[PDB]
Symmetry: D2
Amino acid sequence: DSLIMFLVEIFRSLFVSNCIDKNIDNVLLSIEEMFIDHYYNPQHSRLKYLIDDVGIFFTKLPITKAFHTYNKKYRITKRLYAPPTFNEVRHILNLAQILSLEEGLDLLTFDADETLYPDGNDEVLASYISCLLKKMNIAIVTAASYNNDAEKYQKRLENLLKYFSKHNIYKNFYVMGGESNYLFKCNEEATLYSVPENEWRHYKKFVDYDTVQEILNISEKCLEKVIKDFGLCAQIQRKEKSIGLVPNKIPSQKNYMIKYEVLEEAVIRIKKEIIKNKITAPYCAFNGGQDLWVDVGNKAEGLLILQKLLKIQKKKCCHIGDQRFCSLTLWVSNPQETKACLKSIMH
Amino acid sequence: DSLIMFLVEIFRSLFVSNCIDKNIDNVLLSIEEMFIDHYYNPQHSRLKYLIDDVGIFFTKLPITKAFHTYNKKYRITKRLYAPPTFNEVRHILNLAQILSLEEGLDLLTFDADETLYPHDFNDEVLASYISCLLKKMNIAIVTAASYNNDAEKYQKRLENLLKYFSKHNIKDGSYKNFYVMGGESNYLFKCNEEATLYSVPENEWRHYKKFVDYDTVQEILNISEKCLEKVIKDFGLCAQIQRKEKSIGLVPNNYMIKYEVLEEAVIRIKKEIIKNKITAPYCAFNGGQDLWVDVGNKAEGLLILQKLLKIQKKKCCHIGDQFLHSGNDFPTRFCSLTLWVSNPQETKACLKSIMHLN
Amino acid sequence: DSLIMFLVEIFRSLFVSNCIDKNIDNVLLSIEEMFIDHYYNPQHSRLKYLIDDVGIFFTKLPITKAFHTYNKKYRITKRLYAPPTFNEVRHILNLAQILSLEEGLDLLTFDADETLYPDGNDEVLASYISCLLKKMNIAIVTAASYNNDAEKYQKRLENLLKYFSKHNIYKNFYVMGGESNYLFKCNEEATLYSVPENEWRHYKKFVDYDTVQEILNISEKCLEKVIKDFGLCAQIQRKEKSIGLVPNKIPSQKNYMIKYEVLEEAVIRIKKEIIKNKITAPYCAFNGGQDLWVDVGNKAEGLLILQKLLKIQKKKCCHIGDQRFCSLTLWVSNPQETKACLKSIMH
Amino acid sequence: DSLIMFLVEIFRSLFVSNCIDKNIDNVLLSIEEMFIDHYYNPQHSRLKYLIDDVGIFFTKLPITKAFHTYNKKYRITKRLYAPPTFNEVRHILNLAQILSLEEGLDLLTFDADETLYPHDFNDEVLASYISCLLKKMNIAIVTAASYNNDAEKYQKRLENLLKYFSKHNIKDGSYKNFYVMGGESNYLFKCNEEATLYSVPENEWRHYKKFVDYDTVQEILNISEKCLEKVIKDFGLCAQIQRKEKSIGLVPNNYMIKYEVLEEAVIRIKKEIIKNKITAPYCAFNGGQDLWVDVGNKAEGLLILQKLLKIQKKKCCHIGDQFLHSGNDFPTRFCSLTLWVSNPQETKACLKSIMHLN
């Protein structure tokens, strides 16, 4: 991330010049003003000249207030031998984006790929998530596709729903499967039903069936090449609007393992070949540590569906994931961070 | 750490020139010839000029065969968009060091703290590998944990592995060839037929350990005590200080402590200890959520077993997980063969590869 | 230059792996094939994936033959402590591009900004340039504009023409003023006349007069801002299709000096502001160490004029300058290098 | 070289954060406070920790005033697309070192080889600056050129500057306060009323120069002679070897030699000389088209004048052009104040700024 680096180099220079524990507010306010000017002029701001991939700011980032708030609690400027690190500046930018939600947020989305759990939960999470549900809409997005088989989505994340049956009552909880292709809701008794197409068919970006089938054919061709090239013991699974690469199960249980480097290569191979056919339709190929899934859809399309379905402005939506231009983003990497951010959001 | 990065930068240029999946043997052989010259002339080798902190090669290293063998199993050179990574070159140098044990392997030492268990030992697969290797050679387990020669405390985290020896490795007499060191290089133990850890008096083998005055031991503990007390007040910690003989540490109450706070305090301790020009052996070990300062280093502990068991330096190998410059495994590169590792799964793999004696 | 760096990193790894003085031909041939594949597929080659700004190859670069030829003469691989440097790899790429001219070259162009002389020549140059003129067309390009006043172009480079009056006889020598706006030729007796517009008016890229006047107005506004901001003692000079920033003359001779850093800033300021008005017309702002000149034109337009006027394929044109996609380029920085390259071209 | 890069990296971050043209005094003052602590405690300063080869600050450095004054004259902070460059920070540290001469300047030394003339001295403006400063303090000219105490040869390249002293600086008696050193630190000279360079016997001031055995002098010359002979054959040079007493060099016949060939040969000479553990003073000076090895360094030469003229270390300043790590001016940072320069134009500028005594 060039935005985090950008700040890391600056903090490193203040640290090595021996004034980082002094009053650096003159530098922080000059940085904050560049952020705010980019908020009004995302296309031609000077911040755009420094960071080409800066993206878009839906909020006025209070980075100065975030630095003081982070420094007071963790006291990183008292360090004499290690300047602020990449991971620490990452939490500061999360805090700045959390703090920028002064007007409140009505939509909160969770990337449930790996950030939330390795397998099937956390009660402190479920307790914190439930508190937020009464305040505003929440949503959970999965890259796995089981078509519309609602029972399969429940198996991967059933424990958190058990808390919701108690201490709730409500209808402000949503689950998105296939990245942006299947949207479910919740009734009363430990539920998992699918909203009909009429409620959200128009909001989905229009794509042809043959175009959808074309992407899966291209991805199917690449994975076979990946399987044969790296000699993996794996099987390909094609679905309606998705295709996935899964490892073989050890005969007897537990499944075999694919090296993480090979999965990262296949994602680049698939993404590159899709661009070769000049396909403009939305798509995404996600690596889940042990699985590879290609969906005809992306988090951006699914995020827009929820904003348009629930009539929420983009400034009131927030996303938490391990990995764009349509919602505020918090970068985490473990469930404890997800609960750590959610604890800060409670105010 | 820098030898690995040395190879990563080279393989990156081969990948980038589109020839890494071709025959790169002329480059690899030139690298191997440099490893041979460092093996023969460690003090003024060409490799020492390129890499100052390279360490000592106690054996000739088949780096070409390792790359060739590792590529045949993992096909890393078939990748179009990812050059050989840091961990893959790490695995390559691991196998090259294993293949350099053609002469034999008399002693094998493992880090207790993190290469064997998350903590409580609870891996039946790992211990089943350990028993077979134990039959053919002596093994030892080195921990930074410090209990003042209390064999009951050390056996707690290692109960299952020791209890395994009773059912499979008790009759063959292999139990005598198993040792445990506590406080890095302060308390040595051994096993009996009842699968229990018993003690060996520090007076029995103090001839092999460089003595340190009791006042200088307490000197190091008091300097560290001041730094840890200053560190707690500086960052507003919730943790407390626990002191024992020949060892002091920072322990929470359990509130997790940030990694950066622990790492700098190691630097402050090491920097302030240097300010008094202390030449005694010591180490500031950074744990997951704790910090510990011991009088004595793993290098001294590994030297004791070599002198005690009369084992040759080239026949001794060590398996540690923290081979970073700040880690306590970094100095052990000068007294034994070393295998960088990260978890039991990787440790069981290196042990599986080691079980090809021939 | 990313292409030169690209090779410097590779040579550095061969050097540090202690095999650079051995047979590195396996690496060089793999590099050469990437160059050749980029020659056939400039838009989607793998070299394009490694070097985004690689440009275009009008020739099959014999980089392997260039390395051996450069190594045999200078013996750089016998070094034990310094790998091949950026400047050395630069000469190799010049040699490779010179060697690629196996089918001969009919056009040779010289960037006369600073590469050829600081002031008004070199007889060894003039002797070498004259030998090439009988073989093929030569051309000299200047950023300075004196409209069509041919006498002023002659004053800056009159000494080389004195050699041409002797040992010649002919009509294959050309001079381009205003980057791409004024084209002159040579008669018999120490000459400097201008070819009429009809011979080359159609080949110039069509641009409106008000558009040309717009660029000079924008550049005039920037230079005044540069003058007032940095407090320079300088005067602005506007012309028909150019505007320049010149320093004041010390009263009494010799002229004042502008710091080189300020001139480089004004070029970026002018170029940036021209893009702000979305001007698509060709232009260039050149820094000449002591002068700044903005021309409505560029070396690319002038190069195309000479190729179309003289009916020469792009594979037979070569340019020598200190600083694109329409001719082969040799990178030099001093007159001795220019004569050094020309000595190699004589075969 | 690394202190300059230290400031360049800091100013780059200030420029990038859009506040460099605002008030950056809090950052600059923190930098100045570090320069004061290094001035007081050079051995274990915080600045030495960040920059290991920083050198010695013989005076407190007004780095803020230098930046403020330099910005007022050149307005570098008004640039939108170019942070302060390497040479601008160099000029800033030059002025800060000049402004640190508030106490006085008794001795000023110039590199003859390249800070005074392209070579033949031929700048009337430079010499006219030299005469005025010569009236108020002693100046000296240090050259790597080696002629065995032949005053006629040294005066050739310096004729115009010496002849200028006869017409303007001969009556005031200032001629006595002007010295010339040859062979870096081997032959000292002086001037008379007739504007001629006369010699001073090396026996007269050998008490100030650390003696070196004649066999060890020839030892260094023979080691260099082997390297240069090997270098010529290695790269197929056309040059030849010229040897004198206490000095040896590589000279063409005049075919220009590549810069990289000269620079590595300096490394080979320095590396091989270190291999014999020679502690004598020496230097391998890289010229434009030649290479020279002298027995004795500029640090020794600058030390002689301080001990001979009894001048204080802080009152001595040096003006050299090659302050790179490989250059011969690099060691002079530990015995005198230093001003990095590149040509007479820059040298006349520093001399012009120096003419504000007050």
